[PDB]
Design an enzyme around this catalytic site. Structure first.
Site, PDB file in Angstrom:
ATOM      1  N   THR A 189       0.813  -1.217   0.000  1.00  0.00           N
ATOM      2  CA  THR A 189       0.000   0.000   0.000  1.00  0.00           C
ATOM      3  C   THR A 189       0.837   1.254   0.000  1.00  0.00           C
ATOM      4  O   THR A 189       1.847   1.352   0.676  1.00  0.00           O
ATOM      5  CB  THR A 189      -0.978  -0.011   1.229  1.00  0.00           C
TER       6      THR A 189
HETATM    7 CL    CL Z   1       1.077  -1.247   4.022  1.00  0.00          CL
END
Ligand code: CL
Ligand code: CL
Ligand code: CL
Ligand code: CL
Ligand code: CL
Ligand code: CL
Ligand code: CL
Ligand code: CL
Ligand code: CL
Ligand code: CL
Ligand code: CL
Ligand code: CL
Ligand code: CL
Ligand code: CL
Ligand code: CL
Ligand code: CL
Ligand code: CL
Ligand code: CL
Ligand code: CL
Ligand code: CL
Ligand code: CL
Ligand code: K
Ligand code: K
Ligand code: K
Ligand code: MG
Ligand code: MG
Ligand code: MG
Ligand code: MG
Ligand code: MG
Ligand code: MG
Ligand code: MG
Lengths: 196, 123, 202, 216, 220, 199, 204, 213, 203, 196
Positions: free
Chosen positions: C1
Site C-alpha cells: 500500500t
Molecule cells: Cl502497508
C-alpha cells in the site's frame, strides 16, 4: 510404580494392588493401600499422580456414601462406575483434570460380580480381568493364557500369584508386597498379603 | 615417503632380497623345536655366551600369549618387531573371538606379514 | 500500500494505490483505500484490511452520532482523535496505519497521521503504507509551501506513481480525492493517465 | 544458496508447430522491492535450445556461465555432434539434483525449450531435481494463473500455430501482471524454430482497468 | 474448493465445485457449497466446512428475523456487514471464506468476505484453493454487462479451471443465478467428472462371510 | 514384532511373528524374521526392517568369510561379537535392531541378545520387540530347562501367539525353528487365526 | 495423533429399503489391546443407530450426551426423531465445542420412522454433516475402508447382499490396520427387524 | 531450512501370475495442490523380463532409476549375462541402504519373470527392506488398493470359495477396477492408468483413462 | 549506508555517506566508503565493514597482479567480475553490497552493481545500502539521459543528502569522486555544503 | 540400574556388583557379571551406557594383558588406573567419548591393596571405599558409619551385606543378586553371590 489387578469369577471379584509408595529412588512406605471402600460391595483401586489419586478417590467415596445416606440403599457397581466416569470425563477439559487410572470392583445382588477398567481419559470398559501400571505389560498375557470365566477363587489366587511372581522375576521395580481382597455376596474380605 | 620397489624378480624367477633374508637366517643361532606327545620343546644356541651379559635380556624364546610361544633365528631386531606385532594380534583375536588364537592362526598371521614385506614398496 | 494526503489553502488532497495482497497474490487490484468518515472527512487506510475496515466503520458510527448530538459538522481533529483512541487502546491487536484528512469550518484543511502504535500528529503532508519508504526522498525534495489544489493533486499522483513502480505491495490505479468547503471531488488515474518515468536503459 | 536474494518470478513455455516459445518478465525483485527492472531471465544455450529461469538471479547467472562454457567447449571440437535440448535438460536435472543432495541448492526453477530433428522440446527442472516434459509449462505463480489457461486452450486444440502460441502467451503474461505482486509489465519472448533462437523485447501488455469504476 | 461469482447485466451468477476433502482424501464428492441466505441472496463458502455452514446458517436466520420485522426484502450490504462483523470479532478463528451475491432494491451486489473480516465489493471474485485458476479465467474473459448465458458460461469455465487444476477441487459444477425476476439454483449445472465403470464383479453370495453370533430382534 | 528364543536340554527354540508395519499400516503378514546365517546358526529380527535385514545379511557374509579363512565353524560367541562390533560404530545414528543369535557350537547350545544400543549378552531365554513383554509373561511361566521337545515347541508357539493378541504391532503367523546339535530345522509355520481356534 | 490413540473403525452403508452399520470391537491404548468387546454403535431409536470412532472417552461422552438430548426431544415432541434431524442435533452438539472439540467422527444409519426410507451420514469432529447415497466411513483405517467400499458397493442391494458387502469391506479394511479390529459387529436395519451379527475375524 | 524432498504423488501396483507379471501405475505427477503433468508414468523397463514401479519424490525416482540402469549394464559387462529379476531386487536393496542416512524417498515395486518363467513381485521400503510377494500396492493410494487385492486375489476373509489360479484377464480387470476406485478418493491418483504385462513373449503396454479432477 | 554511482559521457561519479554504526552507536562519523581498486576503478562499499574491506583488499590484489601480467590498464568489467566471483562463491559468509565504477580505454565510464548474493549487472546509475530505500522515487523521477559530469555530481549529492536525512544508518559527510581518462577527483561536502531541503513545518 | 561397591582393608579389597542387565521395564539377565579381570591382581568394574561399557572395559583389559606379554610382568593397580584414566580423558572431547563409571580394585606386591573411583568425566580418586549407581546414595553413609581402616575381611563382607540389604529395603529397583570377589596377595577369589 503402581500396580493394580482384578480378576472376576462367576460369583466374586478378586483384586490386588502393590503396597509401595515411592519417591525418586526410594520406597517411602511398604504397607501402602491403594484400595478405597465405596460401599459394602464396592472397591475403587486408584493409581496415578500424587494428590489427584487420593483427592479423586475420596471425593467419589464420599459421594457414594452420601447417596446411601440420602436414599436408604447403595449405588450398584455399574452405577458407581458410570458416576466415577462422568466425574472424570467432566473434569478432563476443565481447569482441574485428575490424572488417575482406576479399577472398580463390585458385587451386585442381581447382576453378580463386576470389574471395570478406567484410564485417565475416562474411557470405561467392563472386563473379565484387567490391570494397570507398567506391571500390566508383563502380567496381562499370563491372565489371557490361564483365565477362564468359571475360574474358582482358590485357582484365581493361584493365578494372581503367578502374575505377582512374574513381577518379582522380570519387572525392574522392587514391588515386594501386595494387598489382596475379594468381593462377593457377603461383601469385602481381606485376604493375606502376598509377599516376597 | 620412500616407495622404491625393493623386492623384485630376477631373470630366473628369483626374489633375491628374500634369498638374502634367508642368508641372514642361516647365520643366526641354531634353533630347534620338537613336538612331543603332550609336550612341546624349543632349544636354541648361544647368542654369545659372554660372562658379563645379563642373560635375561637376550632370550631367543618369547611368549606370544599364554598358549603360544616362539623361537627365531636371524636378525634379532627384526624378530622383536614380528614378535610385538604377533603379540598385538593375539589380543585382537581374544578381543573379537573370545578364544585364544590357535597356533595355526597366529602362524598364518606372522607368515602373511612376512609375505607382505616381500611385496611392498619401500621395505 | 501507499497512501498520502496533502494540505492546501482551503482543503486537502488524499490519494492511494489500489493493490490488496495476500502474500504475493493480488486479491484486489482496484481497492478503494480512501474511506469517507463524514461529509468532508476521509481516512486513507494501510495495514490489515480487516482491521482498518473495522476501525473505520466504528469511527464512522461514533462520529456520526456525535455530529447529530452536537448539530454541527464534526472537526477533523475529532475524527483523528477517535481513530487515535481506538488505534492506541488496541495497539496490541491491530495493524493499522491511518491518515485522516478533511475540511471543517473552524480549522480548514487538515491532515493527521495515526501510524501504528496509535500516536497522532498533524502534518502539512503525510505518507504511509509499505510503499512510502520509497518516496521519502522524493516528497522531501518536491514539497513546496503554498501549493495550489491542482499542484497538490499532481504532487500526490507523482509520488504515488513512483511508490507503485518500486513496491511490489502497491499498484493498480491511483485514487484521488480533494476535499474543500464546496465538497469532495473524487477521481481515478488509470493506465496511461498514471505519471510515467522511464526505466533507465543503457 | 540457502537464502535467495534477488529473484525472478514466473517463466512460461508452450509448444507450437515448428518450435517452442518461452516468456519471462525482466524484473529482479529484492523481497517486495522491484529492484532491477531491466534484466533478462532467458538464455540462448545453443542454436536449438533456450532456457528461462525463476528464482535467485545470481544462481541463474552461475548456470549461464557454466552452461555457456560447456557449449563453447563442445563447439571447439567441431565434430558434428551438438547437445540436443533433451541433453541440456538431462544435464541440468543432474546438476540441480546434485546440488540439492549436497544441501546447497541452486535456487531456481527452469524451463528448457528447444527444436531439433523436427521435434519441439519443452522441459521443466526445479531446485530439487524434479524434471519432466510437457506441452506447456509455467513456473511460480504461473503454475496457478497461467497453466490453467494454457491447458484449457491445448485441450481444445493440441497443435497451435506460432502466432496462436504467441497470442496465448501474451494473454497469460497479462494475467500475471494483474495478479502476481512480483511481476512487471516489461517482458521478453524467446522463440526457437528451425532457424534458431530469437529473443524479443522489451515488450509490454495492454491492460484494462475498467473494473476500477465497477465497485459493483 | 473453487467458488466464484460474477455481476452480469441483470444480476449475479455464483458458482462452486462439489468436492470436500479430509487431508488429501475426498470425503464428499457432492457437497453443496452455495448456501441460502435469503430468497434474493446466496453465499458460496470455502475454508473450514463446519464454519462456513454454521456462519451462513446463523446469518441467514438473523436476516430472516430482520426481514420478518421490516416486512422488506433484505439487502446484500446487511448480510455483508453481519458476516464481516462476526468474522472480525473471532479474529480469523472462524475459517469461513465467502462469496456473497444477491439482488436487492438497489440492484445486484457481489462481495468477497475473508475469515479475518475484510470484505471487497467487486464485479467478480474467486475464493478457495482453486481461486487463482478461476481468477485467471475471469481476468482473461470477463466483460461488464454480460448476458445471462454468457455469464453462466464464464462462471462454469472458471469453476472448471479450479476443478481440473487444483487437487482440492472436483466433481460437479453448481451455479446459482439471481436476478430481479428469477432465482435459478442449478445443482448440478455440469457433471464433468464420473467414476469409470467396474469391469469385474464381487457379488459375494450368502455364506461367504463366516458368522460367530446372530440375534434377530423383531420390530412393530 | 515379537521374537523369542530359549536354550534347553535339547538345544534352542527360536520363534517369531510375521508382521511388518509402516506406522499403523500393516505392510505385510508374511515376513521371515528368522535368518538362516548358516546350517547351525540363526539370527532373529526386531526393530527397523531394513536395518535388521541388512546387518544380519552382512553378519552372514562375514561368518562365511571366517569359515573359509579359518577352516572351521564360527562360534555363537564370535558371531554375536562380530555383529555387536559392526553396529557399535553406528550408535546414535538411529539404527534400530534387536536380535537373538542362536546356535550350537563346542560350548553347546548358544544364545546371545545383540542390539543397536550396543548390548551383547548371553542368556537362557530372551524375547525382543514391541510384543516382548507379553511373550515374557507366558514363556516365563512355562519355561524349564527340562522341557520335552514337543512341550518347548508348544510354549514358544503359545508365547508368540499371546503376544500377537495383546500387541497391535505383532501378528500373522508364528514361525518356529529348533537348533539341534547337527543343525537347525524349520519346525512349523502356523497362522495366528488357526492357533486362536485351537487355544 | 489424538484420533489414533484408541484406534477403531466404523462404517455405514445403504441398501434398497435397509441400511447397515458396522464397527470393530477393539478397545486399546496405543499398542495395547485392553478389551475386545467395546461398544461403538448405539441405538438412538428402533431403526436409527449412531457409530462413533475416535477417542474412546469421547465416543462414550458423545453417545451419552446425545441420548440425554434425544430423550428430552422425544418426550417434548410427539415422536421419534427423524434421521436427518438426529444428524442436525449431533452437528449442533459437536459445534458447541468448536474450539475444544470431542475427538469423535460419527456415522449415522437408519430408516425414517414413518416412511422407512434409508438414511446414512457422517460428520467431522466439529459437526460438519455429510449425507450420502452409498456409504460413509470413519476411523484410523478410512483409506482402507474407502478402497473396499468403492470397489464392492452397488446400488439397491437386498439385506443379505448388503450384509456381505459391509462385512467384507470392514474385515479386509481392518486387517490392513494395526490398531483396528479384534472383531467386527454388524447391524442390519430393516422395516420389520434388526439383525445383529459378530463376524469371524482375525484377532491380531 | 531448505527441504531436499517434496511429495509428487503416484500409485504403483504389481501382480504375479503363473506365467506373467503386471506392473501398473497412474500417470499424474503432483506437487502441493497442483498438477505438474498428466503424463508421467511410474513404470520403467529394466530388462525384457523385468519392470520397476517407482513413486514418491520425483527427483529421487529419476536419479534411482538412472543408477539402476547403469548398474545393469555394469553387471552385464562384468558377468556376461543380463541380471535376473531376483538379482535386481537384491541389488536394489543394497542401493537403497547405501542412503540409509539420507534416503531415496521412493517406494519401489519390481515385477517380472523369475528363472523358471513364473511371475515375480518384489516390494520395498525406502531404505531397501524387501521380500517377494504374490501381489502388492504401493505409493499414494496403496492403502486403498491393498485390502481389495488381499480379498480378491488372496481370497482373504472368504468362506466356501475355490482358490483358483489367477488368470491374466481377471488380473487385468482387477487392476483397472482398483485404480478407478482409487481415483475416486486419493487426490493424487488420476489422469491415466499405464499397465505393463511381462510374459515370455515380451512386455506389452495398455493405457486406460482415469478422472482428470 | 547510502552509496551511489552514475555514468556520464567519459566517466563516472561515485558517492557515499560517511556513517559507520554498531547498533545505533556511530563508531565512525567520517568513514571513507569509496575505495580505489586500481588507478581508475573504485568500489563503493555497503554491508559489513569487515567483509567489504576484506573483499576489496583481495580484489585489489588480484586485479593489480592481472594488470602487471597483461601490461595494460584493467577493464572495469574485469574488476566487477572479480568482485562478483568472490561475493557469489562466499555469498553465505559475507554481507556485502557493492557498486564497482570506473573508466577504462575500451568501454569508457561504467557502473556495475554487485548486490548481496553476488549477481552482477551493468547500470546507468546504481544505488545501494540501507539508505537507498528512501531515494528510489527521487532517483527515478530525477534521472535524465545525457547528464554532464557536473549534473551527475549534483544529482548524486542531492540523492545522498535526502537518504542521509531519513536513514538513521546513514549520515555525516558526503564523499564524491569523479573518474575519467584524465584521472580521479575527490571531494567532501560537509556541513552547509550538503544540499538542504526544509522540514515541512505547518502553515 | 547398576550398582558397584568396593571396600579396601589392610591387605585386601572386596568388591561387589549387581547381576542385572535391564532394558526398558524388564530384567533381561539376572546373572550378569560387571567385573573384568585385567591381570592376576586387578579387577575393573564398569557400568554406564550400553556398548560403551564393554567396549571400554575390554579395550583396557586387552591392553593391560598386552603390557604383560610385552614386558614379562604386570601393571600395578595404580599404573592401570592411570592408564584407564588417560584413555577416558583423551576420549572425552573426541568424536568417541565413553559414558562409563568405574571402580578399579587391585593388590600390589609393594603398595598393598588399592581401590580407585572414576566417573565418566575421568576424574580419578583413590578411596578406602566407594560406590557407583543410584544405590550409592543409600549405601555410602552406611560405609561412613561403620568402616574402619583395619576392618577384617569377615567384617567387610558383613558391612557389604548391610549395604545390599539396604537396597532390598529402600531402593526402588529390583536388584536381587550380587557378584562378590576379593583381591589380596594370592590373587582374585570368587565369593558366594549375595542373594535375596
Ligand atoms: Cl502497508
Ligand atoms: Cl580369550
Ligand atoms: Cl481494504
Ligand atoms: Cl504506520
Ligand atoms: Cl502508515
Ligand atoms: Cl494492483
Ligand atoms: Cl536492471
Ligand atoms: Cl542469451
Ligand atoms: Cl459493508
Ligand atoms: Cl479452500
Ligand atoms: Cl510367514
Ligand atoms: Cl574373518
Ligand atoms: Cl553375557
Ligand atoms: Cl520392535
Ligand atoms: Cl504351552
Ligand atoms: Cl450435553
Ligand atoms: Cl555519521
Ligand atoms: Cl568501512
Ligand atoms: Cl544489496
Ligand atoms: Cl547494496
Ligand atoms: Cl548498508
Ligand atoms: K508495484
Ligand atoms: K483422484
Ligand atoms: K541520518
Ligand atoms: Mg493438576
Ligand atoms: Mg486481528
Ligand atoms: Mg487390524
Ligand atoms: Mg497383534
Ligand atoms: Mg481437482
Ligand atoms: Mg562474517
Ligand atoms: Mg557414543
Amino acid at each position: 510404580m503402581e500396580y493394580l489387578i482384578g480378576i472376576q469369577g462367576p460369583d466374586y471379584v478378586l483384586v490386588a494392588s502393590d503396597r509401595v509408595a515411592a519417591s525418586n529412588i526410594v520406597q517411602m512406605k511398604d504397607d501402602h493401600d491403594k484400595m478405597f471402600k465405596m460401599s459394602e460391595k464396592i472397591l475403587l483401586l486408584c493409581v496415578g499422580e500424587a494428590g489427584d489419586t487420593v483427592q479423586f478417590a475420596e471425593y467419589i467415596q464420599k459421594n457414594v456414601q452420601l447417596y446411601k445416606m440420602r436414599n436408604g440403599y447403595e449405588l450398584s457397581p455399574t452405577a458407581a462406575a458410570n458416576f466415577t466416569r462422568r466425574n472424570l470425563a467432566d473434569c478432563l477439559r476443565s481447569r482441574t483434570p485428575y490424572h488417575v487410572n482406576l479399577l472398580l470392583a463390585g458385587y451386585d445382588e442381581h447382576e453378580g460380580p463386576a470389574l471395570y477398567y478406567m484410564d485417565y481419559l475416562a474411557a470405561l470398559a467392563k472386563a473379565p480381568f484387567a490391570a494397570h501400571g507398567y506391571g500390566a505389560f508383563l502380567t496381562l498375557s499370563i491372565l489371557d493364557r490361564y483365565y477362564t470365566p468359571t475360574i474358582s477363587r482358590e485357582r484365581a489366587v493361584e493365578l494372581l500369584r503367578k502374575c505377582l511372581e512374574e513381577l518379582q522375576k522380570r519387572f525392574i521395580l522392587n514391588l515386594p508386597t501386595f494387598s489382596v481382597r475379594i468381593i462377593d455376596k457377603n461383601g469385602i474380605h481381606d485376604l493375606d498379603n502376598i509377599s516376597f | 615417503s620412500y616407495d622404491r620397489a625393493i623386492t623384485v624378480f630376477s631373470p630366473d624367477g628369483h626374489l633375491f632380497q628374500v634369498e638374502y633374508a634367508q642368508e641372514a637366517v642361516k647365520k643366526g643361532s641354531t634353533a630347534v623345536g620338537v613336538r612331543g606327545r603332550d609336550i612341546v620343546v624349543l632349544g636354541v644356541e648361544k647368542k654369545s655366551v659372554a660372562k658379563l651379559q645379563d642373560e635375561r635380556t637376550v632370550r631367543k624364546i618369547c611368549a606370544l600369549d599364554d598358549n603360544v610361544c616362539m623361537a627365531f633365528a636371524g636378525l634379532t631386531a627384526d624378530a622383536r618387531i614380528v614378535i610385538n606385532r604377533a603379540r598385538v594380534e593375539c589380543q585382537s583375536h581374544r578381543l573379537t573371538v573370545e578364544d585364544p588364537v590357535t597356533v595355526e592362526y597366529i602362524t598364518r598371521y606372522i607368515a602373511s606379514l612376512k609375505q607382505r614385506y616381500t611385496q611392498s614398496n619401500g621395505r | 500500500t501507499t497512501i498520502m494526503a496533502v494540505q492546501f489553502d482551503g482543503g486537502v488532497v488524499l490519494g492511494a494505490d489500489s493493490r490488496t495482497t495476500t502474500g504475493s497474490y493480488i486479491a484486489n487490484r482496484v481497492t478503494d483505500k480512501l474511506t469517507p468518515i463524514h461529509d468532508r472527512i476521509f481516512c486513507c487506510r494501510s495495514g490489515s484490511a480487516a482491521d482498518t475496515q473495522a476501525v473505520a466503520d466504528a469511527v464512522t458510527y461514533q462520529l456520526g452520532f456525535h455530529s447529530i448530538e452536537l448539530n454541527e459538522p464534526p472537526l477533523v481533529h475529532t475524527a483523528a482523535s477517535l481513530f487515535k483512541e481506538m488505534c492506541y487502546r488496541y495497539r496490541e491487536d491491530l495493524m493499522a496505519g491511518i491518515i485522516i484528512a478533511g475540511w471543517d469550518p473552524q480549522e480548514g484543511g487538515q491532515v493527521y497521521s495515526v501510524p501504528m502504535g496509535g500516536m497522532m500528529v498533524r502534518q502539512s503532508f503525510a505518507i504511509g503504507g509499505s510503499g512510502s519508504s520509497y518516496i521519502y526522498g522524493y516528497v522531501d525534495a518536491t514539497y513546496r509551501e503554498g501549493m495550489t489544489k491542482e499542484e497538490c493533486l499532481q504532487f500526490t499522483a507523482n509520488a504515488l506513481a513512483l511508490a507503485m513502480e518500486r513496491d511490489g505491495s502497491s499498484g493498480g490505479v491511483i485514487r484521488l480525492a480533494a476535499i474543500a468547503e464546496s465538497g469532495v471531488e473524487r477521481q481515478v488515474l488509470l493506465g496511461d493517465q498514471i505519471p510515467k518515468f522511464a526505466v533507465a536503459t543503457l | 544458496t540457502q537464502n535467495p536474494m534477488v529473484t525472478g518470478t514466473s517463466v512460461l513455455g508452450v509448444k507450437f508447430e515448428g518450435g517452442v516459445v518461452i516468456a519471462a518478465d525482466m524484473l529482479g525483485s529484492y523481497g517486495s522491492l522491484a529492484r532491477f527492472r531491466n534484466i533478462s531471465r532467458i538464455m540462448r544455450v545453443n542454436n536449438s535450445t533456450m532456457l528461462g529461469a525463476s528464482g535467485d538471479y545470481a544462481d541463474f547467472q552461475y548456470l549461464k556461465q557454466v552452461l555457456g562454457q560447456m557449449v563453447i567447449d563442445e563447439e571447439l571440437l567441431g565434430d558434428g555432434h551438438s547437445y540436443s535440448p533433451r541433453a541440456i535438460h538431462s544435464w541440468l536435472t543432474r546438476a540441480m539434483y546434485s546440488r540439492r543432495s549436497k544441501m546447497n541448492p541452486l535456487w531456481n526453477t527452469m524451463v528448457i525449450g528447444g527444436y531439433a530433428d523436427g521435434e519441439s522440446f519443452l522441459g521443466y527442472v526445479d531446485m530439487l531435481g524434479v524434471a519432466y516434459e510437457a506441452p506447456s509449462l509455467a513456473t511460480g505463480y504461473g503454475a496457478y494463473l497461467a497453466q490453467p489457461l494454457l491447458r484449457e486452450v491445448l485441450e481444445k486444440q493440441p497443435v497451435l500455430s506460432q502466432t496462436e502460441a504467441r497470442d496465448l502467451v501474451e494473454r497469460c503474461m497479462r494475467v500475471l501482471y494483474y495478479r502476481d505482486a512480483r511481476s512487471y509489465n516489461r517482458f521478453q519472448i524467446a522463440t526457437v524454430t528451425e532457424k534458431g533462437v530469437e529473443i524479443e523485447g522489451p515488450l509490454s501488455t495492454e491492460t484494462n482497468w475498467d473494473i476500477a469504476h465497477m465497485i459493483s | 474448493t473453487t467458488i466464484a461469482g460474477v455481476v452480469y447485466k441483470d444480476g449475479i451468477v455464483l458458482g462452486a465445485d462439489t468436492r470436500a476433502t479430509e487431508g488429501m482424501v475426498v470425503a464428499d464428492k457432492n457437497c453443496s457449497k452455495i448456501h441460502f441466505i435469503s430468497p434474493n441472496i446466496y453465499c458460496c463458502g470455502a475454508g473450514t466446512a463446519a464454519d462456513t455452514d454454521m456462519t451462513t446458517q446463523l446469518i441467514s436466520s438473523n436476516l430472516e428475523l430482520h426481514s420478518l420485522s421490516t416486512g422488506r426484502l433484505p439487502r446484500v450490504v446487511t448480510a455483508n456487514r453481519m458476516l464481516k462483523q462476526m468474522l472480525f470479532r473471532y479474529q480469523g478463528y472462524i475459517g469461513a471464506a465467502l462469496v456473497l451475491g444477491g439482488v436487492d432494491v438497489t440492484g445486484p451486489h457481489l462481495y468477497s468476505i475473508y475469515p479475518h473480516g475484510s470484505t471487497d465489493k467487486l464485479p467478480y471474485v474467486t475464493m478457495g484453493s482453486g481461486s487463482l485458476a478461476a481468477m485467471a479465467v475471469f481476468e482473461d474473459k470477463f466483460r461488464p454487462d454480460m448476458e445471462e448465458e454468457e455469464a453462466k458460461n464464464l462462471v462454469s469455465e472458471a469453476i472448471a479451471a479450479g476443478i481440473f487444476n487444483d487437487l482440492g477441487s472436483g466433481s460437479n459444477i453448481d451455479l446459482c443465478v439471481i436476478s430481479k425476476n428469477k432465482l435459478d439454483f442449478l445443482r448440478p449445472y455440469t457433471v464433468p467428472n464420473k467414476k469409470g465403470t467396474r469391469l469385474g464383479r464381487y457379488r459375494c453370495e450368502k455364506g461367504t462371510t463366516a458368522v460367530l453370533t446372530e440375534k434377530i430382534t423383531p420390530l412393530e | 514384532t515379537t521374537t523369542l528364543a530359549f536354550k534347553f536340554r535339547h538345544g534352542v527354540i527360536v520363534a517369531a511373528d510375521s508382521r511388518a508395519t509402516a506406522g499403523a499400516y500393516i505392510a505385510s503378514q508374511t515376513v521371515k524374521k528368522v535368518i538362516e546365517i548358516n546350517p547351525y546358526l540363526l539370527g532373529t529380527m526386531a526393530g527397523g526392517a531394513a536395518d535388521c535385514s541388512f546387518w544380519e545379511r552382512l553378519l552372514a557374509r562375514q561368518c562365511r568369510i571366517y569359515e573359509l579363512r579359518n577352516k572351521e565353524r564360527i562360534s555363537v560367541a564370535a558371531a554375536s561379537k562380530l555383529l555387536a562390533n559392526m553396529v557399535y560404530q553406528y550408535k546414535g545414528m538411529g539404527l534400530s535392531m534387536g536380535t537373538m543369535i542362536c546356535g550350537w557350537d563346542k560350548r553347546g547350545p548358544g544364545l546371545y541378545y545383540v542390539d543397536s544400543e550396543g548390548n551383547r549378552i548371553s542368556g537362557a531365554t530372551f524375547s525382543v520387540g514391541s510384543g516382548s513383554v507379553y511373550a515374557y509373561g507366558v514363556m516365563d511361566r512355562g519355561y524349564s530347562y527340562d522341557l520335552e521337545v514337543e512341550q518347548a515347541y508348544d510354549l514358544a508357539r503359545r508365547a508368540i501367539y499371546q503376544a500377537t493378541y495383546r500387541d497391535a504391532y505383532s501378528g500373522g503367523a508364528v514361525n518356529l525353528y529348533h537348533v539341534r546339535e547337527d543343525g537347525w530345522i524349520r519346525v512349523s509355520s502356523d497362522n495366528v487365526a488357526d492357533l486362536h481356534e485351537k487355544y | 495423533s489424538i484420533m489414533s490413540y484408541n484406534g477403531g473403525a466404523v462404517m455405514a452403508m445403504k441398501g434398497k429399503n435397509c441400511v447397515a452399520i458396522a464397527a470393530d470391537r477393539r478397545f486399546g491404548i496405543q499398542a495395547q489391546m485392553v478389551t475386545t468387546d467395546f461398544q461403538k454403535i448405539f441405538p438412538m431409536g428402533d431403526r436409527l443407530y449412531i457409530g462413533l470412532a475416535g477417542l474412546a472417552t469421547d465416543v462414550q461422552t458423545v453417545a451419552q450426551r446425545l441420548k440425554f438430548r434425544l430423550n428430552l426431544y422425544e418426550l417434548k415432541e410427539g415422536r421419534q426423531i427423524k434421521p436427518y434431524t438426529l444428524m442436525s442435533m449431533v452437528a449442533n452438539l459437536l459445534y458447541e465445542k468448536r474450539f475444544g472439540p470431542y475427538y469423535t467422527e460419527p456415522v449415522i444409519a437408519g430408516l425414517d420412522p414413518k416412511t422407512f426410507k434409508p438414511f446414512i451420514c457422517s460428520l467431522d469432529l466439529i459437526g460438519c454433516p455429510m449425507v450420502t447415497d452409498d456409504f460413509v466411513v470413519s476411523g484410523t483405517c478410512a483409506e482402507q475402508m474407502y478402497g473396499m467400499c468403492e470397489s464392492l458397493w452397488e446400488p439397491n442391494m437386498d439385506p443379505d447382499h448388503l450384509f456381505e458387502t459391509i462385512s467384507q469391506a470392514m474385515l479386509n479394511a481392518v486387517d490392513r490396520d494395526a490398531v483396528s479390529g479384534m472383531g467386527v459387529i454388524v447391524h442390519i436395519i430393516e422395516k420389520d427387524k434388526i439383525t445383529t451379527r459378530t463376524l469371524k475375524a482375525r484377532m491380531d | 531450512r531448505f527441504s531436499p524432498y517434496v511429495f509428487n504423488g503416484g500409485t504403483i501396483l504389481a501382480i504375479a501370475g503363473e506365467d506373467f507379471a503386471i506392473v501398473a501405475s497412474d500417470t499424474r505427477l503432483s506437487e502441493g495442490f497442483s498438477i505438474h503433468t498428466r503424463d508421467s508414468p511410474k513404470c520403467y523397463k529394466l530388462t525384457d523380463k523385468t519392470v520397476i514401479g517407482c513413486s514418491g519424490f520425483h527427483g529421487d525416482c529419476l536419479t534411482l532409476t538412472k543408477i539402476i540402469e547403469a548398474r545393469l549394464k555394469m553387471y552385464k559387462h562384468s558377468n556376461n549375462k543380463a541380471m535376473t529379476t531376483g538379482a535386481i531386487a537384491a541389488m536394489l536393496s543394497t542401493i537403497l541402504y547405501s542412503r540409509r542416512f539420507f534416503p531415496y524417498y521412493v517406494y519401489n515395486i519390481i515385477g517380472g519373470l523369475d528363472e523358471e518363467g513364473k511371475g515375480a513381485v518384489y516390494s520395498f521400503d525406502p531404505v531397501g527392506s524387501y521380500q517377494r510377494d504374490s501381489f502388492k500396492a504401493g505409493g499414494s493410494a496403496s492403502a486403498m488398493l491393498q485390502p481389495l487385492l488381499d480379498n480378491q486375489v488372496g481370497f482373504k476373509n472368504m468362506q466356501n470359495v475355490e482358490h483358483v489360479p489367477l488368470s491374466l484377464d481377471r488380473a487385468m480387470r482387477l487392476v483397472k477396477d482398483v485404480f478407478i476406485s482409487a481415483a475416486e478418493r486419493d487426490v493424487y491418483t488420476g489422469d491415466a492408468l499405464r499397465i505393463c504385462i511381462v510374459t515370455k513373449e515380451g512386455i506389452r503396454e495398455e493405457t486406460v483413462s482415469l478422472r482428470k479432477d
